Amino acid sequence: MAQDSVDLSCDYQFWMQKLSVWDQASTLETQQDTCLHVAQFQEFLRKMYEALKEMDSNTVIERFPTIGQLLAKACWNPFILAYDESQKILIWCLCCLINKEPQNSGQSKLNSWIQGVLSHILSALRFDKEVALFTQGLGYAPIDYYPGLLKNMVLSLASELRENHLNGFNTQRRMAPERVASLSRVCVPLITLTDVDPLVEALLICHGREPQEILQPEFFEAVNEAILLKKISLPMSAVVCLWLRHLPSLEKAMLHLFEKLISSERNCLRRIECFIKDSSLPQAACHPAIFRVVDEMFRCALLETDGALEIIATIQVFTQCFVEALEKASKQLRFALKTYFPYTSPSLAMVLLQDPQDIPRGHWLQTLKHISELLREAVEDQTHGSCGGPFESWFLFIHFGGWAEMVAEQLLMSAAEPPTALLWLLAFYYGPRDGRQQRAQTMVQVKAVLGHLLAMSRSSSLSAQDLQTVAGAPAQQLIRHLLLNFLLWAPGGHTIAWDVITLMAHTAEITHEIIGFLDQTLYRWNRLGIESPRSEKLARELLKELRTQV
Amino acid sequence: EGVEPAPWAQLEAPARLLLQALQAGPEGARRGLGVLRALGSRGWEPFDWGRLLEALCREEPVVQGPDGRLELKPLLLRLPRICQRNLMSLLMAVRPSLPESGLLSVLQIAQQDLAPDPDAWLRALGELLRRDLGVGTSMEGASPLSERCQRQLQSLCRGLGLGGRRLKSP
Amino acid sequence: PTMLPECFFLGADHVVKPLGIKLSRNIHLWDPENSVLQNLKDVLEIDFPARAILEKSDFTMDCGICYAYQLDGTIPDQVCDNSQCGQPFHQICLYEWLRGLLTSRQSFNIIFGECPYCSKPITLKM
Amino acid sequence: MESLLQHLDRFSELLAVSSTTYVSTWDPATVRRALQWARYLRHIHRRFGRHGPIRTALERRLHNQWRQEGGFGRGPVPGLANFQALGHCDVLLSLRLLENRALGDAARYHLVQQLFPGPGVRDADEETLQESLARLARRRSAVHMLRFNGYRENPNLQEDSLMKTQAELLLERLQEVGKAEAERPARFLSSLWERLPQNNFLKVIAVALLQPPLSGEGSQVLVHWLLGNSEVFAAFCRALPAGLLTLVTSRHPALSPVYLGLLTDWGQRLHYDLQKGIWVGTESQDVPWEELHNRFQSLCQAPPPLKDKVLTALETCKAQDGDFEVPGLSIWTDLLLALR
Ligand SMILES: [Zn+2]
Ligand SMILES: [Zn+2]
């Protein structure tokens, strides 16, 4: 109710004298500029169409003056018509313009001019004449063969490019890289049109022997868009080579993953596994270099937010998908794991790989015992010929969920003299760069808290205040999520749950943290086939109600 | 007239074959491993990497940009992109069994120091390899990623309540 | 060197699993003080073939291009006419090899060109 | 069953007269009527158009009507071609009336209103008018874009997609006449030949012969027409390249023996001059020495079954003209020496 023309009326002249730039784009540079400026102009058209549809035509003159020239430019510009709904919005626009009963002959002229451009778009051979007259004589219409026609056109070229790829230093026709670059710009406007997929596949695969790129990355990223938006449905080898030759696509897609775990679907891990397996990210990650990239990205993410739980959850989902994609399709000659994990020794990794589901529930204690032993041998006796230091082995340890989370729940099950192994381990988890002075401090802290909570579980379902009393920091999140483990695990819970929860419910940040923790633990149980349905339904109801509070 | 030989066409058979293997798409990576398996099996177990690196580094001319401008390139950049990347990936893994002297100059190339329109991949890869050598921290903003990437990463790392984990030791 | 290595197996799925779980369960029993064999025999809970057939270990039947068996159902049937190579190869892999090779020449349907491994005349009939 | 017949014939009447520029009487009622008829008919296309006696009966009505009107005289109307053409029946007429400028005021406005009320009815299960037409113009622009911005004219014409497209159009167009047996395919081929550009026609047929079948009876009917018709064969062998005709012949050995005589006629009606070491044409439009040499060199580069036809047709044509062994005397020896 404020501007009513000007945010639109300025961009009117902008796009207007930009059509004068492009004008059917029979060049390279008109084409390139048009390609980047298409969709913005499309939204401009949406606003314009709204502004027209709401009102009548043939009475107002707001920007009606140059409109015919504007639309004629757009129409004769075919890349306009190649983008998704641009054409259709042009239709609706022109429909807004028509007059039922032209009264002054200018209205009739307008309408006839409209019909003319319409037929120009719809019933016009913009094409060879021989094949036109051939079918005219055969008694056909454009329609009834344009699809298969198009298809044949595509297929010829698709084969051709395979030939060119196979010709790895032959004497034969080295196909024009100019035509290739022409196609690179021709595909993208109509990338969504279904008859094109094999061409694009072939463009991305038939790499050839240039030392320098010959496609424009506008194409690479306009492709990346429709991949990650799932409008294209390509094979896997195509998108891997795309990721593997154009880096900003990879970067921008890994970003698009974070967009979900932060923006929309905080702590619904099944959406996250769904997204990972929807894309071929673990499959692509089977390739080493891509794995190292995404590792570096998550490492930066991890050192900005010093221990973001949602991010760590995402890591472990991705690691699982990657491990299975690796075990699937790498029978002969798979990469030695210190490829993907060089800084660490391989021995520790070799242990970490083992699934919990392989082993009975009892020996997981012994597993974690040897693990924490080895982490101590690593980081405490931090000698050269190993990891650089603590952070690196800690980051290694992140990726293997279950082996990370089982310490608390096992320690709840082994508070009968909880062994120093698990204490040091979880201390190392919740704290890197601590020093043994800090680790021994937190050790006895949590062990005294265990002396409390053991007897507290042996007692009846006591209050939430005997719990909040032992709270009063360097050990707040540790002790917090430890208590959360204790709650569901101990059957004394399920009564004082909301009490403890509303007590610790200071903020929404801690709320989201714990929500992620809970979705994590439920996800873990369902995957492991390890459940107490009490705690399942309990945590379910709680997480559900807290998804209303946020 | 509009034909060229292979730029590798003049070389030791094993290594030339290896290049012709790495040429072959993504999978060429693992084919690299298969080659070395086959050759440690074959009568010539000693594969002189030292020999190979020299030929990678060695310069030769090209006439690119306009029609009227010479420049030099080593083998390593004139050969096709996919072989470069596959090769780099293999090198990461065989890094134990390589000589530093040649590796370093290779990495000086890998930097593509003052290469307008550079190879982002190769740059990141050289960075990472130098890091794996324990010498590529560089005391720089030594991110294989772009500062663009790190920027829009921090832009959303801001939108999460950090943990109290002491990761930096300020 | 006495440490645990990075290790795994190749072969048949059903034979693979049980030893996998033996390892999964005896891994904490690693002792980098005796022989690694001493560690292995009692972690995987087995004794091993000391050259069960020293002669016919594996005359490998992989592609040699893609190092694979069963390429779209195809066997690497195409071989070298050479005593020193004898290497099997896949039809399509060896095709796309010798096609890109500059030295190759096409007949009506049959093509000739150098064996990848030994560089001797090899013939492929589609 | 018969309800479909009177539904269809009235529809096709209305279809053909859509384009006709008598349009003054029309109103949106007629518009809606035609449109809902077309909607019912594409509904029928969906419903039980698939394999059945009704499918075949309606296809018989189609070809019956199309050979009744002929495609000549009173109208060479394209019309809805067949079963699959029915699938977009409304669309074709919508296109007809746009170009029919007898299209008036009110029915036109109501028409465009029907077509494009906006995305106000964006939620619909059937891929409707707007979606279809959008994809249409999408594909059309795509077609021209490729034609001008990456398309190349293949030297191997059979490989070329346009000729390949037209080839399968025509094979579609003749399998139907072979199934129908209303008139012979020869009556159709003749009328075609005369009416349309014969230069393009020959090339189209050249590519047509070589498409592997899909259901090769059309390939047979062609050679049965064309070994009968030589005046086409005269310009045929004249207009085309060498290897095209070579592989055509290896495909249809019936064309081998005739084709040797074609050249052999041209081969004998030339004269050496010792001003210039060449045979040369008496007439302007006679095949040059090298013009023919190319063809025979292609035939040398042919399969062995077709190789020895010409190889001995040459020796026989030589010896009957005197079995000389030196230039200036025998065109055929000039050849046979040039071929080595
Ligand atoms: Zn193979
Ligand atoms: Zn060999």
Contacts of D209 (CB under 8 A, 6+ apart): D219, D222, D223, D248, D251, D252
Query: How many residues comprise chain C?
Result: 126
Contacts of A106 (CB under 8 A, 6+ apart): none
Burial class (CB in 10 A: 0-12, 13-18, 19+), D248: buried
Please report, for residues A114, A401, A477, B45, the alpha-carbon distance to residue A273 in angstroms, rounded to integers and kept in the order given.
Answer: 51, 14, 26, 45
Chain mean position to CA D176: 14
Continuous segment of H or E residues that includes residue C114:
strand C110-114
A368 to chain C: nearest residue by CA? C28
Q: Which amino acid is at A94?
A: L
Pick from C38, C33, C122, C31: nearest CA to C76? C122
Give dist(CA D44, CA D46) in Å, integer: 5
Give dist(CA D248, CA D258) in Å, integer: 13
Tokens coding B124: 């990141």
Task: Sort residue A354 into left (φ over 0), alpha (ψ -120 to 50) or beta.
Answer: beta
- Known binding-site residues of C for Zn(2+) equal 63, 66, 80, 85, 90, 93, 115, 118
Please report, for residues A136, A144, D92, the alpha-carbon distance to residue D15 in angstroms, rounded to integers and kept in the order given.
Answer: 17, 16, 9
Tokens coding A385: 């010929």
Instruction: Decide if A196 contacts A187 (C-beta within 8 A).
Output: yes
Q: Residue for token digits 């595509």?
A: A154
Contacts of C99 (CB under 8 A, 6+ apart): A166, A167, A168, A170, C111
Pick from A106, A86, A116: nearest CA to A15? A86
Query: What number of other Cβ atoms are within 10 A of residue C72's Cβ?
Result: 7
Contact residues on chain A for B61, CB-CB shorter than 8 A: none
Contacts of A127 (CB under 8 A, 6+ apart): D143, D144, D147
Residues forming a β-bridge with C105: C112
- C98: CA distance to ligand 1 center in Å? 13
What are the two backbone dihedrals, phi and then psi, of residue A51, each rounded to the nearest 5 degrees?
A: -60, -30
- A168: CA distance to ligand 2 center in Å? 20
CA geometry: angle D296, D299, D301, nearest 5 deg: 120
Instruction: Decide if D43 contacts D15 (C-beta within 8 A).
Output: no
Ligand nearest to the CA of C80: 2
Give dist(CA A64, CA C60) in Å, integer: 77
Output the CA torsion D193→D194→D195→D201 (10° steps): 30
E-strand spans in D76-174?
none
Query: What number of other Cβ atoms are within 10 A of residue D138's Cβ?
Result: 23
Pick from D327, C3, D289, B125: nearest CA to A293? B125
Give dist(CA B122, CA B87) in Å, integer: 10
Instruction: Decide if A52 contacts A160 (C-beta within 8 A).
Output: no
Contact residues on chain A for C20, CB-CB shorter than 8 A: 358
C66 to chain B: nearest residue by CA? B31
Give dist(CA C44, CA C22) in Å, integer: 5
Three-state secondary structure call for residue D72 = strand
Give dist(CA D331, CA D323) in Å, integer: 11
Pick from A222, A213, A218, A275: nearest CA to A244? A213
Q: Residue for token digits 């492709």?
A: A223
Q: Which amino acid is at A475?
A: A
Chains near C with 3+ CB pairs less than 8 A apart are A, B
Contact residues on chain B for A308, CB-CB shorter than 8 A: 157, 160-163
Among A100, A127, A183, the residue with its CB nearest the CB of D147 is A127
Q: Classify the C-alpha dihedral A502-A535-A367-A457 as positive or negative.
A: positive
Contacts of C107 (CB under 8 A, 6+ apart): none
Give dist(CA D28, CA D110) in Å, integer: 6
Q: Residue for token digits 């990761």?
A: B167
Among C6, C96, C101, the residue with its CB nearest the CB of A346 is C6
- B80: CA distance to ligand 2 center in Å? 26
Burial class (CB in 10 A: 0-12, 13-18, 19+), A22: buried
Tokens coding C111: 């093509």
Contact residues on chain C for B30, CB-CB shorter than 8 A: 67
E-strand spans in A363-522?
none
Give dist(CA A357, CA A524) in Å, integer: 11
Among A212, A247, A391, the residue with its CB nearest the CB of B121 is A247
Instruction: Decide if D31 contacts D111 (C-beta within 8 A).
Output: yes
Three-state secondary structure call for residue B156 = helix
Contacts of C38 (CB under 8 A, 6+ apart): C31
Give the HSE-up count for residue A6: Cα atoms under 13 Å, Cβ half-sphere: 3
- C80: CA distance to ligand 1 center in Å? 15
Contacts of A432 (CB under 8 A, 6+ apart): A390, A391, A394, B165, B166, B167
Residues forming a β-bridge with B61: B72
Give dist(CA B66, CA B80) in Å, integer: 20
Q: What is the DSSP code string of chain C? A: --S-------S-HHHHHHHHHHHHHHGGG--TTS-HHHHHHHHTT----SSTTSS-S----S-SSS--S-BTTB---B--S-TTT---B-HHHHHHHHHHSSS-EE-SSEEEEE-TTT--EEEEE-
Continuous segment of H or E residues that includes residue B73:
strand B70-74
- A207: CA distance to ligand 1 center in Å? 19
Query: What number of other Cβ atoms are within 10 A of residue D280's Cβ?
Result: 13
Q: Residue for token digits 């495909």?
A: D251
Give dist(CA A223, CA A221) in Å, integer: 5
What are the two backbone dihedrals, phi and then psi, of residue C105, each rounded to the nearest 5 degrees?
A: -145, 140
Give dist(CA D65, CA D49) in Å, integer: 19
Q: What is the DSSP code string of D255-288? A: HHHHHHHHHHHHHHSEEEETTTBEEEESSTTS--
CA geometry: angle C106, C111, C113, nearest 5 deg: 105
Tokens coding C118: 């030994």
Please report, for residues A228, A292, B134, D40, the alpha-carbon distance to residue A296 in angstroms, rounded to integers and kept in the order given.
Answer: 21, 6, 16, 60
Q: Answer whether A64 touches B (CB < 8 Å).
A: no
Min Cα separation D224/chain A (Å) = 21
Burial A453-477 (b: 16+ CB within 10 A, else e): beebbeeeeeebeebeeeeeeebeb
Give dist(CA A381, CA D149) in Å, integer: 66
Pick from B101, B71, B89, D101: nearest CA to A212? B71
Contacts of A170 (CB under 8 A, 6+ apart): B3, C99, C100, C101, C102, C104
Min Cα separation D131/chain A (Å) = 8
Q: Classify the C-alpha dihedral A160-A161-A165-A167 as positive or negative.
A: positive
Instruction: Decide if A3 contacts A55 (C-beta within 8 A).
Output: no
Tokens coding A131: 């094949």
Residues, CB within 5 angstroms of ligand 1 (ion): C 63, 65-66, 71, 90, 93
Instruction: Decide if A300 contacts B145 (C-beta within 8 A).
Output: yes
Q: Which amino acid is at A110?
A: L
Give dist(CA D152, CA A157) in Å, integer: 9
Which method resolved this structure? cryo-EM
Q: Answer whether C11 touches A (CB < 8 Å).
A: no
Q: What is the DSSP code string of B29-56? A: HHHHHHHHHHHHHSS-----HHHHHHHH
Q: Which amino acid is at A116?
A: G
Contact residues on chain A for D12, CB-CB shorter than 8 A: none
Instruction: Decide if B150 contacts B113 (C-beta within 8 A).
Output: no
Q: Which amino acid is at C36?
A: V
Task: Sort residue C47 into left (φ over 0), alpha (ψ -120 to 50) or beta.
Answer: beta
Min Cα separation B34/chain C (Å) = 7
Pick from D97, D77, D80: nearest CA to D44? D80
B78 to chain A: nearest residue by CA? A211
Instruction: Decide if C111 contacts C104 (C-beta within 8 A).
Output: yes
Query: What number of other Cβ atoms are within 10 A of residue C114's Cβ?
Result: 16
Residues forming a β-bridge with D278: D273
Burial class (CB in 10 A: 0-12, 13-18, 19+), D297: middle
Continuous segment of H or E residues that includes residue A30:
helix A29-53
Yes or no, beta carbons of A153 and D119 under 8 Å apart: no
